[PDB]
């Protein structure tokens, strides 16, 4: 299932800041991201159309840490859903619990989010959930279990959360480190880097 390997070679295949490992920093930049994607990484390669849209699709699916078959599930439902397929695709993909745990801010990385949610710590509506794929319903509060509280990791991540500047579609108190989800975002309020229609025609073959 999960990736389990070097993070920032995946981050530097697209030459972007993919946010895969942040912690004390945001981007490492000392790790030579653009200069060495592989042994032949240094020489620039011309990208043909299928390569630009596939390369993009790989990028987003790595930034959110999803595999391809349930990413294709997310797409087939996204298309089946009413409204623009790109916009509501991304939005329903952000409904993933691990993503939300990251956006509320308590967590290091979305892989750490995977860790924390998998380990029984997360609590939704007074119920525990292991599943990182759980799509959080709108206007629903989510908390972390009381005994799971006191873990060193959660606050040391909260500090990071204040630094990153936080999202506007979620309201997080973080006094008890319990925030509330509000509404599913729209394409315009986030990212401005991913180009989603590349994915939608890539699957329109």
């Amino acid at each position: 299932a999960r990736y389990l390997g070097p993070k920032l070679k995946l981050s530097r295949r697209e030459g972007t800041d993919l946010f895969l490992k942040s912690g004390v920093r945001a981007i490492d930049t000392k790790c030579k991201i653009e200069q060495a994607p592989g042994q032949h990484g240094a020489r620039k390669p011309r990208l043909s159309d299928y390569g630009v849209q596939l390369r993009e699709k790989q990028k987003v699916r790595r930034i959110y840490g999803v595999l391809e078959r349930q990413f294709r599930n997310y797409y087939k439902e996204a298309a089946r859903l009413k409204g623009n397929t790109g916009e509501n695709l991304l939005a329903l993909l952000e409904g993933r619990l691990d993503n939300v745990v990251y956006r509320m801010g308590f967590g290091a990385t979305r892989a750490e989010a995977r860790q924390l949610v998998s380990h029984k710590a997360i609590m939704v509506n007074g119920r525990v959930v292991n599943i990182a794929s759980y799509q959080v319903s709108p206007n629903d509060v989510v908390s972390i279990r009381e005994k799971a509280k006191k873990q060193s990791r959660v606050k040391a991540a909260l500090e990071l959360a204040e630094q990153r500047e936080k999202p506007t579609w979620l309201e997080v108190d973080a006094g008890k480190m319990e925030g509330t989800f509000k509404r599913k975002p729209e394409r315009s309020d986030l990212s401005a880097d991913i180009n989603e229609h590349l994915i939608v025609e890539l699957y329109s073959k």
């Binding site: 004390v24 920093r25 000392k30 630094q163």
Partner: protein, 614 residues
């Protein structure tokens, strides 16, 4: 009580059995047709006492000798019928030699055809048998004179067979089964029948069939013509098993056994005892339980011989097998499987002494465990295979104190200590060899010490020394506790002239090298060591400064949170005159340190001492 009948042809082997057990051994049509025993037949004798003896009737013909060697496996007692016709014949001798090499504990001689010859011949043959038995190492033997036609001495013979003891085997053993006849019964399955050499099996067990190499679930089983939920060693076990394989694919000589076995090995060492001298590098027929193979023998030191197989075969330690003349005719020698994986350097002078240690010295697995440890690290896969040890039996090594058990192989406390010493002194050599380095790394240590060994054991052993405190390491660099990362004069001599220079204004590496006429790479590395000492600090790669300007860099950052409340470039020029390039590299130096952190427009102060009291 498995009892095998042996003797020369038509000396009443089968007839005796029908007398004792009322079972007609011959079942194959041709033997019915030709009046002989072409292939092995089995007879059983249930008793009201509840214990059933197992009777194996083997042919006597030299042509069918290859069949008899399959049934002589796992005999508890052997009865050699000798007929007073011609008395002891050469083939009787051959059967005796074969039983001797299989190391059967005892035998009962029963003399037939009492009616056909007068009493005189009974005493004469008696004498001749008593003389022949001494040749083959069976001293105590019970001679019975009987004629199966009239059943004259059948009764006297009967009580003795019940009197025979059952030779037991150790409680914990991997089940091992010698397939004999693969035959499909119409009702329910594939039923393969074979002698169980060791262990117990139950209906729920999963087995590994060899040559098909596929696991097979036991559907049902018969202990000895008796349905049962379990089966113990020392009896023929009809075994009805499910799974992918089928009878046509099965070929006599396949093993059923509890766990996947390691790959069959062609070479092997054997204790050698023989009636006639062998000859170096000579072809012969290796007979192993229900297996026919041709391999070439070699002679090492004294009574130690090497078998090389052209057909790979699964063998376990302490397995008696017979080596026969390659063109047949003559049984010449015996064999025992002693080492399962001999390497090269056989006749080198140090090792023969070792072989003596491994074989003559120990009759048990625990002693063997120590012997192998003396030789080196002991792989549990290989040792379990050689000794056929179950989980319970395997855990006993763990119980013995002073055993390093890593991911795989065991190590004795003395040998462990020896390795520890070698590693330490090798460590010391590397320590001495590079005096400018913080120490060697863990993996590099293992490569500089014992590259050929198992990684888990050698590294676990390293951990043992770490915990003892013999090696203290920091930042993952393992150096002796005595090391101070002091350096050598060879560095200081440059650092003396480098000192005033560095002082009044520090400069870049390539410029430094140019100023003192020293090689760039040499100069950069010596100064990096100087920087490990705490004399100069690189704010960026190849750029080195003093300390007194680092604290000054903190003085300029000091006024930013208090006077501005933000961090920006502009104050580089509007505060002291320190350039933008300099200030930015200063900032990235302090960002990596943790004096400041960068997010969007500004630098945070989560963890530093930049802060004044008020």
């Amino acid at each position: 009580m498995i009892i095998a009948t042996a003797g020369h042809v038509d000396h009443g082997k089968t007839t005796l059995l029908q007398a004792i057990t009322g079972v007609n051994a011959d079942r194959l049509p041709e033997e019915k047709k030709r009046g002989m025993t072409i292939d092995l037949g089995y007879a059983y004798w249930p008793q009201p006492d509840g214990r059933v003896p197992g009777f194996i009737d083997v042919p006597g013909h030299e042509k069918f000798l290859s069949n008899m060697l399959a049934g002589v496996g796992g005999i508890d007692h052997a009865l050699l019928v000798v007929a007073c016709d011609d008395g002891v014949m050469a083939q009787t001798r051959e059967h005796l030699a074969i039983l001797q090499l299989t190391g059967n504990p005892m035998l009962t001689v029963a003399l037939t055809k009492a009616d056909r010859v007068d009493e005189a011949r009974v005493d004469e043959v008696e004498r001749q048998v008593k003389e022949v038995l001494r040749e083959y190492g069976f001293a105590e033997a019970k001679l019975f004179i009987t004629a199966a036609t009239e059943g004259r001495g059948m009764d006297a013979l009967r009580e003795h067979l019940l009197q025979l003891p059952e030779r037991e085997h150790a409680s914990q053993h991997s089940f091992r089964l010698a397939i004999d006849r693969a035959f499909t019964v119409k009702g329910a399955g594939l039923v393969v029948t074979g002698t169980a050499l060791s262990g117990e099996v139950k209906v729920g067990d999963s087995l590994w069939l060899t040559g098909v190499n596929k696991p097979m679930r036991v559907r049902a089983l018969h202990a000895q013509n008796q349905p049962t939920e379990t089966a113990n060693a020392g009896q023929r076990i009809a075994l009805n098993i499910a799974g992918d394989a089928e009878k046509e694919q099965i070929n006599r000589g396949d093993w059923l056994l509890a766990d996947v076995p390691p790959e069959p090995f062609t070479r092997v060492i054997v204790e050698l005892q023989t009636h006639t001298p062998l000859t170096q590098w000579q072809p012969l027929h290796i007979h192993h339980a229900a297996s026919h193979v041709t391999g070439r023998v070699s002679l090492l030191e004294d009574n130690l011989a090497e078998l090389v197989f052209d057909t790979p075969l699964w063998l376990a330690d302490n397995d008696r097998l017979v080596l026969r003349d390659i063109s047949a005719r003559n049984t010449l020698a015996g064999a025992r499987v002693v080492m399962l994986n001999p390497p090269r350097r056989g006749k080198r002078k140090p090792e023969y002494l070792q072989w003596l240690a491994s074989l003559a010295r120990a009759q048990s697995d625990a002693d063997a465990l120590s012997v192998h440890l003396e030789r080196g690290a002991v792989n549990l896969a290989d040792f379990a295979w050689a000794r056929q040890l179950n989980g319970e039996g395997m855990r006993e090594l763990l119980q013995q104190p002073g055993y390093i058990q890593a991911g795989y192989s065991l190590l004795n406390a003395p040998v462990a200590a020896r390795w520890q010493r070698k590693i330490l002194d090798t460590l010391a050599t590397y320590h001495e060899q590079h005096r400018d380095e913080p120490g060697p790394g863990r993996e590099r240590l293992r490569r500089m010490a014992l590259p050929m060994e198992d990684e888990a054991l050698v590294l676990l052993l390293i951990e043992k020394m770490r915990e003892s405190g013999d090696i203290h390491s920091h930042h993952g660099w393992l150096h002796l506790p005595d090391h101070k990362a002091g350096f050598s004069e060879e560095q200081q001599a440059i650092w003396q002239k480098a000192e005033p220079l560095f002082g009044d204004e520090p400069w870049w590496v390539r410029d430094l090298a140019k100023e003192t006429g020293t090689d760039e790479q040499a100069m950069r590395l010596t100064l990096r060591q100087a920087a490990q000492q705490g004399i100069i600090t690189a704010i960026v790669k190849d750029r080195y400064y003093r300390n007194d300007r680092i604290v000054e860099f903190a003085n300029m950052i000091r006024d930013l949170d208090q006077e501005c409340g933000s961090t920006c470039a502009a104050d580089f020029r509007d505060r002291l005159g320190v350039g933008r390039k300099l200030a930015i590299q200063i900032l990235e130096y302090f960002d990596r340190i943790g004096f400041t952190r960068r997010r969007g427009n500004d630098h945070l102060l989560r963890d530093a001492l930049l802060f004044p009291e008020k």
